[PDB]
Design a protein around this nucleic acid. Structure first.
Ligand SMILES: [Mg+2]
Ligand SMILES: [Mg+2]
Ligand SMILES: [Mg+2]
Ligand SMILES: [Mg+2]
Ligand SMILES: [Mg+2]
Ligand SMILES: [Mg+2]
Ligand SMILES: [Mg+2]
Ligand SMILES: [Mg+2]
Ligand SMILES: [Mg+2]
Ligand SMILES: [Mg+2]
Ligand SMILES: [Mg+2]
Ligand SMILES: [Mg+2]
Ligand SMILES: [Mg+2]
Ligand SMILES: [Mg+2]
Ligand SMILES: [Mg+2]
Ligand SMILES: [Mg+2]
Ligand SMILES: [Mg+2]
Ligand SMILES: [Mg+2]
Ligand SMILES: [Mg+2]
Ligand SMILES: [Mg+2]
Ligand SMILES: [Mg+2]
Ligand SMILES: [Mg+2]
Ligand SMILES: [Mg+2]
Ligand SMILES: [Mg+2]
Ligand SMILES: [Mg+2]
Ligand SMILES: [Mg+2]
Ligand SMILES: [Mg+2]
Ligand SMILES: [Mg+2]
Ligand SMILES: [Mg+2]
Ligand SMILES: [Mg+2]
Ligand SMILES: [Mg+2]
Ligand SMILES: [Mg+2]
Ligand SMILES: [Mg+2]
Ligand SMILES: [Mg+2]
Ligand SMILES: [Mg+2]
Ligand SMILES: [Mg+2]
Ligand SMILES: [Mg+2]
Ligand SMILES: [Mg+2]
Ligand SMILES: [Mg+2]
Ligand SMILES: [Mg+2]
Ligand SMILES: [Zn+2]
Lengths: 91, 252, 52, 135, 97, 77
RNA sequence: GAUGGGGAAGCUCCGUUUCAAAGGCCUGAUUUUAUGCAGGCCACCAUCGAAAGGGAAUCCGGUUAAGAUUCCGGAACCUGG
RNA sequence: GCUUGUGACGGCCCGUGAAAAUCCACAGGAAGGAAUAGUUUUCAUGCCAGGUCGUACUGAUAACCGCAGCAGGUCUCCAAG
RNA sequence: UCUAAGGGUCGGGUACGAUCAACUUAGAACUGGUACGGACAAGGGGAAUCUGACUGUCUAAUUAAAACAUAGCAUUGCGAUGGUCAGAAAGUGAUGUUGACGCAAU
RNA sequence: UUUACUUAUUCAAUGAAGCGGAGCUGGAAUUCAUUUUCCACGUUCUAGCAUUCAAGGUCCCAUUCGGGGCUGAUCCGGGUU
C-alpha cells in the first residue's frame, strides 16, 4: 500500500524547506538509518549512532566510519592505497 | 560609538567554549623511548562521540614501560579502526590504518592524520572529520618530509613528526543540509556562543561600521586592510580578490 | 555493600564477582593457546637461526 | 587419536576449578544414568606450589611447595585437551566412580593424590603441570 | 574446483555443520578434514586448530566468510566450520587438501 | 523483628544472659474453616530483636509456660 | 580563590600545578623510653562554591492552647569504638 | 479506568544527553598461621557512644516584593463522583 | 424497546461442552407540539493583489510589521613563529578539551 | 653581504627514562695485506597474562629466619630531550 509517491522518510518534513533540500536529506537519511553487514561476524546488524560510529548489534564490535555511511569512498580507496604501498615494504 | 561584536569575543565571557561534556583532549602518545626506537602495542578499548566534535574519538590503552599500570590515551579515530584492534606506535612500526608512524618512515603517497608540526607536539594537522594529509616528498639529509595539508597548502616538517595511517572518521558530515534553524542551534549549543548572526548592516552606527542609513547598505568598500585596527576590521579582511569564484580552483 | 556478607559480592569461580564467566572461559583459552603458540613461535625461529 | 584417554592433561574451563589444570584418569566417553554427557574423572590441582627461590630456606620450602589437590567428575565440554601428559598409576584406583558418593571416600582419595602430586613436583617431573595458568 | 568438491561431499557423504559439533567430531577422532571460514575469529580458529593437531586432523582455511561457507554447503544459513567425517565419491581428502 | 519455630532453640533464648523480660500473648482464632482455637505467642525480648514463637497448640503451650525460667520476668497477656 | 612566582609608582593585576627543594600513610626498630630511625611505598599541590545535583541510617500508634519522621510508647537501622 | 512508579523494547540527533566524595569486588601473593592444639570477626549473639546549628507560623485578593490588609508580581508536591 | 457481531478460564486416548466477566460498533421497532452536540462546550467561508519562504525574534510602559533571525547561497582571512579578538603590563588572556568536513570576518 | 657555531635570548616536551661517544656480538659488503666501511644489534595470527630491589648464576654474614654485594641488564661524559 504505497504511502507516498516520492518523499518516503522525508514525509516527516511536510512542505517545509523546499523540495531540493528534502531530496539531499532523504539520501543521507536513508543511508544513515540503514542496517549494514558486519565485516567480523557477518550478520547485517551494524547500525549508526553519533556520526562516524558504526556498531554491531550481536557481536558488539564498533567501527569508526563515514558520518552517514559505514564506509566512505575516500576511506576505501585510501585503504587500497595503503595496501599497495605496504606491499612495497616486504616485497 | 560602541565596541562592536567581533571585539567583544575576546574577553571570553559568554564567548568561551562549551566544554563540560567533552571526552578530554585528543593527543598522540608522548614521544617516548618506545615510539622512537621501536614500536609499542595498544588496544582501542572503545571509540566514542565527543560533544561538539565531528569525528569520533578512539580510547586507546597502553602498558606503561616503566611502571606496572595501564595508561590510556585519547586518539581521533581514523575511519575503519575498530574496538579490539591492536594499534602500533613507533619508528619501526608497520604501515596499516590506525598505527602511528613518523612521516620519515612512510613512503610517498601515504595517507595520514593528526600529524605533528614539530616532533612530539602530540598531534596538530588534519583532525576535523574527513581531513588527512599526504606525504609528497622526502629529503634524507636534514630529515624533512614534505606534505600537502587539507587546505591545499604544502608544508615541510621534521621526518620525525608522527602521523597516523588513514583518514579521520565521520567524513561527509557537511553534505547534509542542516534543514532548519534549530539543528544549527543545537550544533552551536555544544560549541560556542557564535550563533545566530545579526548582520552589521541591520545595526545602528554605534554598533558597527555597517550600521545606519535610510536603506541597508555597506556605504564603503567592504574589503578592509590588514593594517586596519580593532573596531575597523569587519568585512572582507585583507581580501585579495572578491566576487564569484568562476573556474577550477585547486592549487598547482 | 559494606553491610553485607561477602558471599553477596561474588560467585566462587576465578574472577568471581568481577567478570561474567563466559568471559572467563574466553580468557582461559586465549591465555592457553597464546602461551602454546609462543613455544611454537620460538622453535620455528630457533631453527631458522640454525637453518639459513 | 581419541585424545581423551588416561594420560591426558587438560585445563578445566568452567566452574571454581576454572582455569586449573587436571589429569584425566578415567573417561566415560559417552553416557551415564546420571551424567548424560561425555565426561571425565579428573584430579587436578587447586592450590599451586608457590614460587621457590634461593632465599627460601629450610621449612619455607616445605611450606611453599605444598599442593592442595581436588577431584572432579566433569563434562568434556569443559576441558581444554592439552598436548602434555602425566602418569596416573599411583591413583588409578583412588579416582573412581565409587570414589565419589560418600565424602569421606573423597577425602581419602585427595589425601593420596596429594602425596602423589607433591612426590611428582619435588624432583621436577611434569614441570608445566605444577605452575599456574595466568589469564 | 574446491567448491565443486565440497558439493559432491554434501550430496554423497557424511558431514556436520557448526562449532560445537565439529568438536564432538574432533574429540572423537571422527573428523577427516575441517574447513574454516575466513572471518570466523582467531580464537575459535586457534582452538579448532589445536583440537585438530591433537586428533592428527588436517584443516582447510576457506577463503570466504561464514555467509558463503554456508552457500558452499548449499544451506540458507551461515556456517563458520564444517567437519567431513565421511568423504563421499569426492576426493577432497586426497587432493590439494 | 523475628519469628521462631524450633521449640528447642526457643528455650535457649530464654536463658541467654541478656533476656530479662518476655511476654505471652493469647489469641482467639479460628481453625481451618469450622471452629475456634486458643493460639498463644511467646515473645522474648532480646537486646536487638524481639523473638516470637507461636504455639498453635493449646496443650504444648501450657506445658511450655511452666518450662520458663523462674527468673525470667514474663508479662502475662 | 590563597600559595613559589611574574607584572604594576602603587591601591593591586596575572597564574592554580603554573619555569617551586611543595608533602604523609603504614608499620617496623624501643623494651635507657618515649617514640628517634629502618624499609617500601603514594606524588594526589590549597581552599570556598548546591537547604532542587551526589549522599550511611527510623517507622507506626499516641500525645500539645501552640512541637513533633524531633516528645512518649513500641519496634528498628547506620556509623564509630 | 486515573495518577504515579518500573521493566523489556522502539523513534530521534552535524544534539548522543555532569563531576567528585564514598562503597564494594577482583587480579596479585608480601607475610602470618595447627595436633596437644592454632587461625579465623565480611556467620550469629553480646557492650558502650553518636557533638554543633535550623526545626513556631505565613507562603499570599492581609504574614514576601509593588510607599498599603494594592484586582499587579512571585519556584513547587498531593488531587474524589 | 429490541436484534446481531466482537472475548477469558478450565479437563479431552498417544466434533463440542462447562462457567465468569466487559462498553464498543452497526441495524430495527415504538415515541414526541419536528424536538434531540437541547445548558455547557464549539472553525465563518470563497476569489485575488502586495509582502516575508516557513516555525522562531524585538521596541517592559503608544510601533509585532513587510523589520531581526533562520536554513540555503556566495565571498574573505588563517597551517600555530598563525588568523580574529582581549589587556597598563606580564613567565597575561578568549577561539582552544580547537586544526581548514576548522576557527574567525562579511 | 653570505653561512657556519651555542652559551645569551626564544619555543616545545616530560611525575626531566634510556641522550651523545665508544664497544660487543651478527651480518650485507670486497679484501689489493687485513679491514678500508655501511646497516643492523630481544615485542605483530588472537579483546589473555606482564607489579614485591627478579628468577637464575656467583661471592659474603659465621649460618636461623633473615639479609647484603656482584652479575643478570657492557663501557665512558653527569648537556633532561
Ligand atoms: Mg574554557
Ligand atoms: Mg546567542
Ligand atoms: Mg550573516
Ligand atoms: Mg543574519
Ligand atoms: Mg535598525
Ligand atoms: Mg562607526
Ligand atoms: Mg568605514
Ligand atoms: Mg550603513
Ligand atoms: Mg543591502
Ligand atoms: Mg553469590
Ligand atoms: Mg586465590
Ligand atoms: Mg589570584
Ligand atoms: Mg564545600
Ligand atoms: Mg546537598
Ligand atoms: Mg542534595
Ligand atoms: Mg503522629
Ligand atoms: Mg509542649
Ligand atoms: Mg503545626
Ligand atoms: Mg522514640
Ligand atoms: Mg527497644
Ligand atoms: Mg559494628
Ligand atoms: Mg507529574
Ligand atoms: Mg544512548
Ligand atoms: Mg559490587
Ligand atoms: Mg616479606
Ligand atoms: Mg559483623
Ligand atoms: Mg571529633
Ligand atoms: Mg512545621
Ligand atoms: Mg494569611
Ligand atoms: Mg496584592
Ligand atoms: Mg455476545
Ligand atoms: Mg436495509
Ligand atoms: Mg514571517
Ligand atoms: Mg509566526
Ligand atoms: Mg511596546
Ligand atoms: Mg523608550
Ligand atoms: Mg506576531
Ligand atoms: Mg534562493
Ligand atoms: Mg615576563
Ligand atoms: Mg626528558
Ligand atoms: Zn558482528
Amino acid at each position: 500500500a504505497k504511502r507516498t509517491k516520492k518523499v518516503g522518510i522525508t514525509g516527516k518534513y511536510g512542505v517545509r524547506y523546499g523540495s531540493s533540500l528534502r531530496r539531499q536529506v532523504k539520501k543521507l537519511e536513508i543511508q544513515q538509518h540503514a542496517r549494514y553487514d558486519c565485516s567480523f561476524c557477518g550478520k547485517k546488524t551494524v547500525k549508526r549512532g553519533a556520526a562516524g560510529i558504526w556498531t554491531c548489534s550481536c557481536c558488539k564490535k564498533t567501527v569508526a566510519g563515514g558520518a552517514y555511511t559505514v564506509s566512505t569512498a575516500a576511506a576505501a580507496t585510501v585503504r587500497s592505497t595503503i595496501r599497495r604501498l605496504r606491499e612495497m615494504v616486504e616485497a | 560609538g560602541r565596541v562592536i561584536r567581533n571585539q567583544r569575543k575576546g574577553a571570553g565571557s559568554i564567548f568561551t567554549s562549551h566544554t563540560r561534556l567533552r571526552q578530554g583532549a585528543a593527543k598522540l602518545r608522548t614521544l617516548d623511548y618506545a615510539e622512537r626506537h621501536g614500536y609499542i602495542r595498544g588496544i582501542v578499548k572503545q571509540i566514542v562521540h565527543d560533544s561538539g566534535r565531528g569525528a569520533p574519538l578512539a580510547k586507546v590503552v597502553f602498558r606503561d614501560p616503566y611502571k606496572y599500570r595501564l595508561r590510556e590515551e585519547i586518539f581521533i579515530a581514523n575511519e575503519g579502526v575498530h574496538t579490539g584492534q591492536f594499534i602500533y606506535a613507533g619508528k619501526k612500526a608497520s604501515l596499516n590504518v590506525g598505527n602511528v608512524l613518523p612521516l620519515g618512515s612512510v613512503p610517498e603517497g601515504t595517507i595520514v592524520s593528526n600529524v605533528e608540526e614539530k616532533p612530539g607536539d602530540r598531534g596538530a594537522l588534519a583532525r576535523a572529520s574527513g581531513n588527512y594529509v599526504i606525504i609528497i616528498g622526502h629529503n634524507p639529509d636534514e630529515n624533512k618530509t614534505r606534505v600537502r595539508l587539507p587546505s591545499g597548502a604544502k608544508k615541510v616538517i621534521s621526518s620525525d613528526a608522527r602521523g597516523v595511517i588513514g583518514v579521520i572518521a565521520g567524513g561527509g558530515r557537511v553534505d547534509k543540509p542542516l534543514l532548519k534553524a534549530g539543528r544549527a542551534f543545537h550544533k552551536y549549543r555544544l560549541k560556542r556562543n557564535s550563533w545566530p548572526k545579526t548582520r552589521g548592516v541591520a545595526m545602528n552606527p554605534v554598533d558597527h561600521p555597517h550600521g545606519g542609513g535610510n536603506h541597508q547598505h555597506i556605504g564603503k568598500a567592504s574589503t578592509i586592510s590588514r593594517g586596519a585596527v580593532s573596531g575597523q576590521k569587519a568585512g572582507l579582511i585583507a581580501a585579495r580578490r572578491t566576487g564569484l569564484l568562476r573556474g577550477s580552483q585547486k592549487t598547482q | 555493600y559494606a553491610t553485607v556478607s561477602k558471599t553477596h559480592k561474588t560467585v566462587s569461580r576465578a574472577y568471581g564477582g568481577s567478570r561474567c564467566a563466559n568471559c572467563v572461559k574466553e580468557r582461559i583459552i586465549r591465555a592457553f593457546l597464546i602461551e602454546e603458540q609462543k613455544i611454537v613461535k620460538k622453535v620455528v625461529k630457533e631453527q631458522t637461526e640454525a637453518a639459513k | 587419536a581419541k585424545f581423551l584417554k588416561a594420560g591426558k592433561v587438560a585445563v578445566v574451563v568452567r566452574g571454581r576449578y576454572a582455569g586449573k589444570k587436571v589429569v584425566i584418569v578415567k573417561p566415560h566417553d559417552e553416557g551415564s544414568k546420571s551424567h548424560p554427557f561425555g565426561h571425565a574423572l579428573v584430579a587436578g590441582i587447586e592450590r599451586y606450589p608457590l614460587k621457590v627461590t634461593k632465599k627460601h630456606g629450610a621449612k619455607k620450602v616445605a611450606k611453599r611447595t605444598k599442593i592442595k589437590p581436588f577431584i572432579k567428575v566433569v563434562n568434556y565440554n569443559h576441558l581444554l585437551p592439552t598436548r602434555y601428559t602425566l602418569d596416573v598409576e599411583a591413583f588409578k584406583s583412588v579416582v573412581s566412580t565409587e570414589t565419589f558418593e560418600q565424602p569421606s571416600q573423597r577425602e581419602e582419595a585427595k589425601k593420596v593424590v596429594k602425596k602423589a602430586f607433591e612426590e611428582r613436583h619435588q624432583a621436577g617431573k611434569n614441570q608445566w603441570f605444577f605452575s599456574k595458568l595466568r589469564f | 574446483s574446491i567448491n565443486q568438491k565440497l558439493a559432491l561431499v554434501i550430496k554423497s557423504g557424511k558431514y556436520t555443520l557448526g562449532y560445537k559439533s565439529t568438536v564432538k567430531s574432533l574429540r572423537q577422532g571422527k573428523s577427516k578434514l575441517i574447513i574454516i571460514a575466513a572471518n570466523t575469529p582467531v580464537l575459535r580458529k586457534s582452538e579448532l586448530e589445536y583440537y585438530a593437531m591433537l586428533s592428527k586432523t588436517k584443516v582447510y582455511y576457506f577463503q570466504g566468510g561464514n555467509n558463503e561457507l554456508g552457500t558452499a554447503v548449499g544451506k540458507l544459513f551461515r556456517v563458520g566450520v564444517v567437519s567431513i567425517l565421511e568423504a563421499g565419491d569426492s576426493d577432497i581428502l586426497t587432493t590439494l587438501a | 523483628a523475628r519469628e521462631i519455630t524450633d521449640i528447642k532453640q526457643f528455650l535457649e533464648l530464654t536463658r541467654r544472659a541478656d533476656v530479662k523480660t518476655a511476654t505471652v500473648k493469647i489469641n482467639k482464632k479460628l481453625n481451618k474453616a469450622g471452629k475456634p482455637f486458643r493460639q498463644t505467642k511467646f515473645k522474648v525480648r532480646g537486646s536487638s530483636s524481639l523473638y516470637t514463637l507461636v504455639i498453635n497448640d493449646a496443650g504444648k503451650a501450657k506445658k511450655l509456660i511452666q518450662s520458663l525460667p523462674p527468673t525470667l520476668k514474663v508479662n502475662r497477656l
